[PDB]
Design a protein around this nucleic acid. Structure first.
Ligand SMILES: Nc1ncnc2c1ncn2[C@@H]1O[C@H](COP(=O)(O)OP(=O)(O)OP(=O)(O)O)[C@@H](O)[C@H]1O
Ligand SMILES: [K+]
Ligand SMILES: [K+]
Ligand SMILES: [K+]
Ligand SMILES: [K+]
Ligand SMILES: [K+]
Ligand SMILES: [K+]
Ligand SMILES: [K+]
Ligand SMILES: [K+]
Ligand SMILES: [K+]
Ligand SMILES: [Mg+2]
Ligand SMILES: [Mg+2]
Ligand SMILES: [Mg+2]
Ligand SMILES: [Mg+2]
Ligand SMILES: [Mg+2]
Ligand SMILES: [Mg+2]
Ligand SMILES: [Mg+2]
Ligand SMILES: [Mg+2]
Ligand SMILES: [Mg+2]
Ligand SMILES: [Mg+2]
Ligand SMILES: [Mg+2]
Ligand SMILES: [Mg+2]
Ligand SMILES: [Mg+2]
Ligand SMILES: [Zn+2]
Lengths: 80, 74, 177, 48, 118, 134, 299
RNA sequence: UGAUGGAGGUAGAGCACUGUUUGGACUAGGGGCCCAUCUCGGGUUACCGAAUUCAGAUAAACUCCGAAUGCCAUUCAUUUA
RNA sequence: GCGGUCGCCUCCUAAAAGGUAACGGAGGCGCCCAAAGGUUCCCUCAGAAUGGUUGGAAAUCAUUCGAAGAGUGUAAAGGCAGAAGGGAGCUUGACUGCGAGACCUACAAGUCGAGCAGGGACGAAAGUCGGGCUUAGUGAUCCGGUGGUUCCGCAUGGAAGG
RNA sequence: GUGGUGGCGAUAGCGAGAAGGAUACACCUGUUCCCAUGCCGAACACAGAAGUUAAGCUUCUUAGCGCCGAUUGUAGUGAAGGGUUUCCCUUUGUGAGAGUAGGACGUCGCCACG
RNA sequence: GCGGGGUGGAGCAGUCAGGUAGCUCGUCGGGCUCAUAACCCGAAGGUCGUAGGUUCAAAUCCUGCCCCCGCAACCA
RNA sequence: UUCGGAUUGCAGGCUGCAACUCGCCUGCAUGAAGCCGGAAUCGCUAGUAAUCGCGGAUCAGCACGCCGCGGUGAAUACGUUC
């Protein structure tokens, strides 16, 4: 890689906030927070709310209710 | 309107195969390299093939479908 | 390095088993990743391409090569050599790192993300994903974008068949529909 | 606009060479390292 | 699916163009160089006769071995002195389509120092 | 019949000697009309012959026109002296050399075919003969 | 050309000469058209009309000799075209200056508790004499000078364009096109405006270091125009400009639909702009504009 | 005149390129008909049909080919001048 | 007579060397390039299919298929993919004095040229370079202008003028 | 047997299939080093030897394509003649293209390791 | 064959000499009027015949093509 | 825009046999044009204009209209040429 022409790159850890699952990868962005890491090495830490494990599709279960049908709505409203 | 034409350039071969020629004799006038310069033959600025040394002229085939001129001193 | 680790450990033996490879050399691998951002707006204003290039560099970690129109096209007001479109090539560690980031972070942040296409294959074992909008990558900062844009990521592998390609991408993690 | 021009040797003020240049493409006086026969060595020749 | 062209074939494509103006004669033989991942080979060839006058390589067992660069230097020294024994002084260096940068450069400089004229 | 395009507006008259290079055998039709002489044939003559043949056939069967009038011939108007360049292209012809199968017909009984070809031949300038597919 | 007399005499003599030259070219064109018209009449006549065909060729010879001695009218030098329009709209309070005091370190205070407020689409003249603080005040507004005391507030609706007095906004090393380069304008857009400022074709690749002060002033003005700001802080804009370009500048500013803070020692330019309020220095006096400007100058 | 060696693209022929061109197969595609129209998807004329393919022609300014002749030359041969 | 044409380049006519006419059939030239030249190194096209945000027949990207169906400043022919096409670095050989010998040719001209010397560019070296893939892009003499010059200088030294 | 390196018109090619790595050649491991990418150690460059014949490569099978191609006949044609002369015919010499019989999945050297 | 022209509905500019599509009448809507005309206020209407080149950029410059108009197309 | 409150979604309240065509009203959600208006044109001379509500007739329900009531409460009239 040519020198002084590429955006700064630094290794960084990632923790899924919702579940805590951890994965180490490089990125351009830097996080003031830093955490240790196996092999006894510290890296800036980027907390992410949603990851592959967190995302419902990967797990195989979906949170969404999928809404209600109008027949059922009518019965609920009118007690029928 | 037609009626124009340039002077003919008297191209073609100027020396026969098996003919003895002196150094620098023009062997073949051409546009582009219809024939290639072989041994002891140079190609001029405008594709003219000339003998670099004295000898006998020889036209051979350069491979499958290309020709070549060589000058062999005796 | 996580994705390379995952590949070599789990993915490689699993593909070997499924596809009955005589030697591990036959194992398909992600050969390279080419991220291409076609910017026709540069003709109207070159700074659109400039900012697009900057965003792409932030996303990729490598300065992009600014590809140029090989042919002048009056239809798009395009003159030959006009610097429209950029690309970046990632191999080895950078390739694996970017791919893992795409799987984990950039993909979820897509609006109403229903997964990735499962037919966008050339027919030779090489895939492409069309990202409609940026701001899904953490490095875009959701504000620096003056004009939102998209891109095309081309994953070129050593697989001969879309089937082996599909399994490999799934193993590395690909939200196929 | 392409025009004929003369390259004069700076060392001896000798107008050794004739050439031509496009004024628009080369507004400034052309300068070349050319052999000066009078001085028998390479010198800077500038258009005049 | 992606193909990686055979590096040797690409080398040969460049080597043909090199040979279009480099060729060997009895009194000015061609010094042909071949380079592999492991070893490097030098030959002195008379194309007119189509015979290799002298040869050296990292397999001669007269080369102690070492870093591939210095092995090339030893091959160059060995071929230069062998060519001198056969009375060859001037040669034309065929870089075999490689770049005159590294192992080949070391080998060529070794040949120059040990007495081949080129 | 007229070619859609021509590389050159004006063309040499040419010379017709010997047998036709190709097309001397019946290809598609059951019956064919073979030229026994060499002559120019105009698009008008081709068209007249074709119409006569088809009318007699009652739109029964198929008709192939083997020849096409590629060549163009020019002329000079009355009262114009020699010189001052070639004339403007006047018409289109097909140089037909003896042995060429000008027309073919199929899908019709033999006697109808022979009569149809006879009418077409009378329209054409060359002497002709009927040829059966082999 | 050298004339005897004054500027008006030169204009009178010059205007007459170009008038007399123009009439000469008109009559030479008429004679050429007359011959041309007859040549055409012969050209389209029947080939059987031998005499007319003969006369047509004879007149064709005269026509050729005329067309070869036909003086070319010199292309009249093109004048500048300015169309300054604001992108956004002015507010009732574009600029707020309140109790602003400033002094250059080591020198007397130029003004104390200076407080004024512009109204919007107003022609505001900063009057004064040489070395009184006029340019300092304008530098103060832009932010070049930080006020020693007080505050300067720009409404969020106010976009500002600055024309410095000494032409300090140009890179002498770069070219004309490079100087005017902006992120908001494409190349052909820049060229069209530079042509409106009399920079034609490869005249835009010239280094700014070789231009005259007047030509540089046009580049600075072009930068001001390309901003499309609604507030114009102009410090002696007509300086270095030829008299024709000055009137164009003043006339176009008069029609400008925005606020103008201007400094000018040229009486003609201020009249064209039609000043509304004048601020006298060093004695701070926000006043309605009038021929009373002369009274302040006298006093 | 013979023997030998050459340069060249004509006659002829050929379709390998470029034009011109016929019929068949298939068909992207285009045409109007109705359903559905948010004009969305059909299903249609043995509707018109590019490209491909099969078969068949054609050429001074086409050639995968290619003569007879003529031409250049040979320390050549015979005869001649 | 009217119209057309007048010099130069390319093709067909032209009859397989060369040459070969017509108010025969087609087109081009009166330049352009400071790189679009030299050299060292490096690269290979056009299209088609498949996939792919904006994006559409067709912008950029990827694989495969692809021998040239592309490109070669500019007409055509010849030639070029061992490049003459394309890219990069350095450069100015788009050199000075010539030039055995050839082609063309009524003359005047025109064309090609190894090689020798002077002094260089590139390259490690070999070696290439006296413009550009080749063939148009031009005009005799007289007369005059500019620059150089160890030439002459009407008794001599200058000058005037050659 | 393999690797370098050449000569000869592809009868040396292409396509398809099969076998091999002992050495050798390659893929192949890396980027600290010279050196590099109009981004990328992909390439070039360098360092190095964990694995694999998977590919390249080598050897072998195949006539599918491409290539070479006799004889016979014919077109044309030099020469000498004729006719009813835009053409056609005869004698003599020459003789294609096409279409085929067939040929052919190379051959001739040198070096180095076996 | 020689010329002249293709710019909003009509008549015209612009074009030479590249940067920004106008003038007169008309049309549409609304005013004024008892109503119409005139008059007043707003609005629409062309990417310049068309296809290609040149240029950073074309109504403008270059080439072709298609339309429309006048003329000519043969003389003792 | 904490202006503006159109349009729209959902959920309700009534009246009525029945509120889709086609009622009024409520809550939440949404948040339109609109930045004081060209030519022209209208009302008004004092408790008037302006502005603020309240009641009523019709009427199951339904008014920005109509009729009426009160609250606050101005500017200007030189003058009769048009
Ligand atoms: N950077 C400075 N440093 C020190 N003193 C300064 C500086 N700038 C200006 N001064 C002083 O400020 C005083 C007025 O400043 P300013 O430049 O505004 O004059 P002015 O109003 O522009 O006069 P004019 O434009 O007519 O010449 C001058 O006397 C000057 O000497
Ligand atoms: K007949
Ligand atoms: K063909
Ligand atoms: K021919
Ligand atoms: K170069
Ligand atoms: K490697
Ligand atoms: K293998
Ligand atoms: K074979
Ligand atoms: K209702
Ligand atoms: K009510
Ligand atoms: Mg010629
Ligand atoms: Mg040349
Ligand atoms: Mg000042
Ligand atoms: Mg023929
Ligand atoms: Mg000839
Ligand atoms: Mg001949
Ligand atoms: Mg070139
Ligand atoms: Mg004297
Ligand atoms: Mg005297
Ligand atoms: Mg044969
Ligand atoms: Mg407001
Ligand atoms: Mg009253
Ligand atoms: Mg009241
Ligand atoms: Zn000098």
């Amino acid at each position: 890689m040519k020198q002084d022409i590429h955006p700064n790159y630094q290794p960084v850890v990632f923790m899924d906030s919702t579940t805590g699952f951890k994965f180490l990868s490089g990125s351009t962005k830097g996080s003031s927070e830093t955490v240790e890491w196996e092999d006894g090495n510290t890296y800036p830490l980027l907390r992410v709310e949603v990851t592959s494990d967190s995302h419902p599709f990967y797990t195989g279960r979906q949170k969404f209710t999928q809404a209600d049908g109008r027949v059922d709505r009518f019965n609920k409203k009118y007690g029928l | 309107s037609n009626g124009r034409d340039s002077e003919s350039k008297r191209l073609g071969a100027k020396s026969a195969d098996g003919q003895t020629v002196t150094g620098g004799s023009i062997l073949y006038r051409q546009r582009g390299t219809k024939i290639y310069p072989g041994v002891n033959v140079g190609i001029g600025g405008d594709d003219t093939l000339f003998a670099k040394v004295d000898g006998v002229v020889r036209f051979e085939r350069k491979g499958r479908d290309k020709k070549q001129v060589s000058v062999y001193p005796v | 390095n996580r994705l390379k680790e995952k590949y070599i450990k789990e993915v490689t033996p699993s593909l070997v088993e499924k596809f009955n490879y005589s030697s591990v050399m036959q194992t398909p691998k992600v050969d390279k990743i080419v991220i291409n951002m076609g910017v026709g707006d540069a003709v109207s204003n070159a700074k659109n391409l400039d900012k697009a290039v900057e965003e792409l560099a932030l996303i990729t970690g490598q300065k992009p090569l600014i590809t140029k129109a090989k042919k002048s096209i009056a239809g798009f007001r395009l003159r030959e050599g006009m610097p429209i479109g950029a690309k970046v090539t990632l191999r080895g560690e950078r390739m694996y790192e970017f791919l893992d980031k795409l799987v984990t972070v950039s993909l979820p942040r897509v609006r109403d993300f229903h997964g990735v296409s499962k037919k966008a294959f050339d027919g030779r074992g090489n895939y492409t994903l069309g990202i409609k909008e940026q701001l899904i990558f953490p490095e875009v900062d959701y504000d620096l974008v003056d004009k939102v844009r998209g891109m095309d990521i081309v994953i070129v592998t050593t697989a001969n068949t879309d089937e082996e390609s599909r399994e490999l991408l799934a193993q590395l993690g690909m939200p196929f529909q | 606009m392409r025009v004929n021009i003369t390259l004069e040797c700076t060392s001896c003020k000798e107008r050794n060479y004739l050439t031509n240049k496009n004024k628009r493409n080369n507004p400034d006086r052309l300068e070349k390292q050319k052999y000066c026969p009078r001085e028998r060595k390479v010198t800077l020749h500038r258009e005049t | 699916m992606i193909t990686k062209p055979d590096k040797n074939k690409t080398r040969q494509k460049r080597h043909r163009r090199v040979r279009n103006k480099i060729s060997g004669t009895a009194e000015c033989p061609r010094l042909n160089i071949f380079r592999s991942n492991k070893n490097i080979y030098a030959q002195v060839i008379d194309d007119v006769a189509g015979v290799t006058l002298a040869s050296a390589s990292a397999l001669d067992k007269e080369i102690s071995g070492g870093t591939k660069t210095e092995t090339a230097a030893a091959v160059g020294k060995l071929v230069a002195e062998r060519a001198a024994e056969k009375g060859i002084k001037k040669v034309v260096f065929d870089r075999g389509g490689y770049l005159y940068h590294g192992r080949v450069q070391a080998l060529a400089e070794a040949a120059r120092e040990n007495g081949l004229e080129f | 019949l007229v070619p859609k395009r021509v590389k050159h507006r004006r063309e040499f008259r040419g010379k017709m000697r010997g047998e036709a290079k190709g097309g001397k055998e019946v290809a598609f039709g059951e019956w064919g009309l073979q030229a026994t002489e060499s002559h120019w044939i105009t698009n008008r003559q081709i068209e007249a012959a074709r119409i006569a043949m088809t009318r007699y056939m009652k739109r029964g069967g198929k008709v192939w026109i083997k020849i096409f009038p590629h060549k163009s011939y020019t002329s000079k108007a009355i009262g114009v002296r020699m010189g001052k360049g070639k004339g403007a292209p006047e018409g289109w012809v097909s140089p037909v050399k003896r042995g060429k199968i000008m027309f073919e017909i199929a899908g019709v009984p033999e006697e109808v075919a022979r009569e149809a070809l006879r009418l077409a031949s009378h329209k054409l300038p060359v002497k002709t003969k009927i040829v059966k597919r082999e | 050309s050298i004339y005897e007399g004054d500027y008006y005499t030169y204009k009178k003599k010059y205007s007459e000469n170009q008038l007399l030259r123009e009439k000469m070219i008109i009559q030479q064109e008429k004679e050429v058209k007359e011959l041309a018209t007859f040549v055409q009449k012969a050209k389209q006549a029947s080939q059987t009309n031998h005499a007319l065909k003969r006369m047509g060729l004879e007149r064709a010879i005269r026509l050729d000799k005329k067309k070869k001695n036909l003086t070319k009218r010199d292309k009249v030098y093109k004048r500048v075209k300015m169309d300054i329009k604001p992108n956004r709209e002015v507010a009732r309070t574009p600029l707020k200056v309140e109790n602003v005091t400033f002094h250059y370190p080591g020198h007397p205070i130029l003004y104390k508790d200076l407080s004024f407020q512009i109204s919007g689409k107003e022609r505001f003249l900063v009057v004064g004499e040489n070395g009184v603080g006029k340019s300092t005040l304008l530098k103060l507004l832009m932010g070049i000078n930080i006020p020693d005391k007080g505050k300067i507030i720009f409404n969020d609706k106010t976009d500002v364009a600055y024309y410095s007095q000494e032409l300090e906004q140009l890179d002498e090393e770069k070219t004309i096109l490079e100087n005017v380069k902006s992120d908001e304008y494409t190349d052909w857009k820049l060229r069209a405006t530079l042509s409106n400022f009399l920079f034609y074709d490869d005249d835009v690749n010239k280094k700014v270091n070789v231009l005259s002060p007047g030509e540089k002033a046009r580049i600075v003005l072009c930068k001001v125009l390309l901003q499309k700001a609604n507030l114009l802080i102009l410090d002696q804009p007509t300086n270095h400009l030829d008299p024709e370009t000055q009137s164009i500048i003043g006339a176009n500013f008069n029609l400008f639909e925005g606020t103008i803070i201007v400094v000018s020692h040229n009486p003609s330019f201020v009249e064209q702009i039609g000043i509304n309020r004048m601020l006298i220095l060093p004695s701070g006096n926000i006043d309605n504009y009038s021929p009373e400007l002369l009274e302040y100058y006298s006093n």
